[PDB]
Design a protein around this ligand. Structure first.
Ligand SMILES: Cc1cc([C@@H]2CN(C(=O)c3ccc(F)c(Br)c3)CC(F)(F)C2)n2ncnc2n1
Ligand SMILES: [Mg+2]
Ligand SMILES: [Zn+2]
Length: 342
C-alpha cells in the first residue's frame, strides 16, 4: 500500500521541474547523495523529462511511474550497492547529457538505454562480488557462472523481469526492432559494469581515443557506451573529498562484511575484503591510480569538457596520500589504554 500511495502521487501530482530539485542539480559539482531518498523517484522522472525521453519515446506516464518505483524496490540495502548508488549513477548520466553534448556521439536510443541501464545496473545486489557467488555456490552462480559476470547478468535479468511485470514495460509500444535494440543495449551496458570487462576492453578504448571517435563506426558507439557506463558507475570519485571519504567507508563496510563470510566458510578473502589486512589508504591509492584515474583520463581525451572530472579524481587520489599518516597510531589511543594490544 506504501508503493500504491507513492505511485498515486508520482502519477497525478505532476513532474517537478529539474531546477526545483536543486539550483546546481545539472552541475558536475552537485552531489546527488545529498538528495533525500524519498525525493529520488521524482528526480528520476524530472531528469527523464528534461532530457525529453518521455515525449520523444511517448512513454506512458502510469507505466513509467510504476517502472521507476519497481526499480527502486528492486535494490536491497547493503552499505554501497543500494538504490542511492543507482540513483547517483543515473544522475551522473544526466550530467553527461547536460554537459558533454552526447548527441554528437550517440544515437538518441543509445543515450536513453544508457540512462535506463544506469537505473537498473545493480538490481538486487547482495553486497558480494562475482567470485563470492562461485565460491559460495549461490543460485546466481548456478545460473550464470559458465558465462561470467554473474552479478551483472543477474542485474540485467532483474531489469527484464521488471519490464515483464504487468504495467511496467515502458517500451511495450516500441516497434519490434526498437524493442530488440533497447534490450540488447541494456544487456551490453549492464554487462559493461563488470570491471573485468572494462579492463579487457581498455586497450580498445585507448585505441579509439588515439585515432579519434568515428560516429559512423558502430564498434566506436559500443566502446563509448561502455566507457560512459563505467564513468557513471565510478562517478562518486569525481566529487569532493568528503563524498569520496564517505563512499570509501561504505565500500569497505560492504567488502569487510563479505570477507567475514568468506573466513566463516574457510576461505582466505581478497586483501581488500579482509578487515585484518586491508590498508585502506594504499588500497584507495591503487584503485584511483590503476582504475579510476585512467578511466577519467580517457573521458577527458574524448570530451575536453570532462577535464575537470579527471582533475577531481586526481586531487582525491593525492588527498589519500596526504591523510595516510593518520592511519598510524601516534602516542596513546584516546582512552589512554593499550588494551587493544591484547
Ligand atoms: C566509486 C567507487 C567504486 C568502488 C568499487 C570498485 N570495485 C572493485 O572491485 C575494486 C577494485 C579494485 C580495488 F582496489 C578496490 Br579498493 C575495489 C568494484 C565495486 F566494489 F563494485 C565498487 N570503489 N572501490 C574503492 N573506491 C571505490 N569507489
Ligand atoms: Mg555492479
Ligand atoms: Zn554500480
Amino acid at each position: 500500500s506504501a508503493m500504491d500511495d507513492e505511485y498515486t502521487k508520482l502519477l497525478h501530482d505532476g513532474i517537478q521541474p529539474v531546477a526545483a530539485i536543486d539550483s546546481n542539480f545539472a552541475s558536475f559539482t552537485y552531489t546527488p547523495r545529498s538528495l533525500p531518498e524519498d525525493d529520488t523517484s521524482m528526480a528520476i522522472l524530472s531528469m527523464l523529462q528534461d532530457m525529453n525521453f518521455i515525449n520523444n519515446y511517448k512513454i506512458d506516464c502510469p507505466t513509467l511511474a510504476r517502472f521507476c518505483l519497481m526499480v527502486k524496490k528492486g535494490y536491497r540495502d547493503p552499505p554501497y550497492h543500494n538504490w542511492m548508488h543507482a540513483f547517483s549513477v543515473s544522475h551522473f548520466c544526466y550530467l553527461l547529457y547536460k554537459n558533454l553534448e552526447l548527441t554528437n556521439y550517440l544515437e538518441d536510443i543509445e543515450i536513453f538505454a544508457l540512462f535506463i541501464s544506469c537505473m537498473c545496473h545493480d538490481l538486487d545486489h547482495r553486497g558480494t562480488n562475482n567470485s563470492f557467488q562461485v565460491a559460495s555456490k549461490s543460485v546466481l552462480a548456478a545460473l550464470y557462472s559458465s558465462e561470467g559476470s554473474v552479478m551483472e547478468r543477474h542485474h540485467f535479468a532483474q531489469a527484464i523481469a521488471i519490464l515483464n511485470t504487468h504495467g511496467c514495460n515502458i517500451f511495450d509500444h516500441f516497434s519490434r526492432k526498437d524493442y530488440q535494440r533497447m534490450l540488447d543495449l541494456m544487456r551490453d551496458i549492464i554487462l559493461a559494469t563488470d570491471l573485468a570487462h572494462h579492463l579487457r576492453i581498455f586497450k580498445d578504448l585507448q585505441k579509439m581515443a588515439e585515432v579519434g571517435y568515428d560516429r559512423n563506426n558502430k564498434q566506436h558507439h559500443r566502446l563509448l557506451l561502455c566507457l560512459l557506463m563505467t564513468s557513471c558507475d565510478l562517478s562518486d570519485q569525481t566529487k569532493g573529498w568528503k563524498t569520496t571519504r564517505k563512499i570509501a567507508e561504505l565500500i569497505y563496510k560492504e567488502f569487510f562484511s563479505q570477507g567475514d563470510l568468506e573466513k566463516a566458510m574457510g576461505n582466505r578473502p581478497m586483501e581488500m575484503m579482509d578487515r585484518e589486512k586491508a590498508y585502506i589508504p594504499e588500497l584507495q591509492i591503487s584503485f584511483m591510480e590503476h582504475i579510476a584515474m585512467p578511466i577519467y583520463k580517457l573521458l577527458q581525451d574524448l570530451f575536453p569538457k570532462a577535464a575537470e572530472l579527471y582533475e577531481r579524481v586526481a586531487s582525491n587520489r593525492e588527498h589519500w596520500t596526504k591523510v595516510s599518516h593518520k592511519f598510524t597510531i601516534r602516542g596513546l589511543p584516546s582512552n589512554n589504554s593499550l588494551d587493544f594490544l591484547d
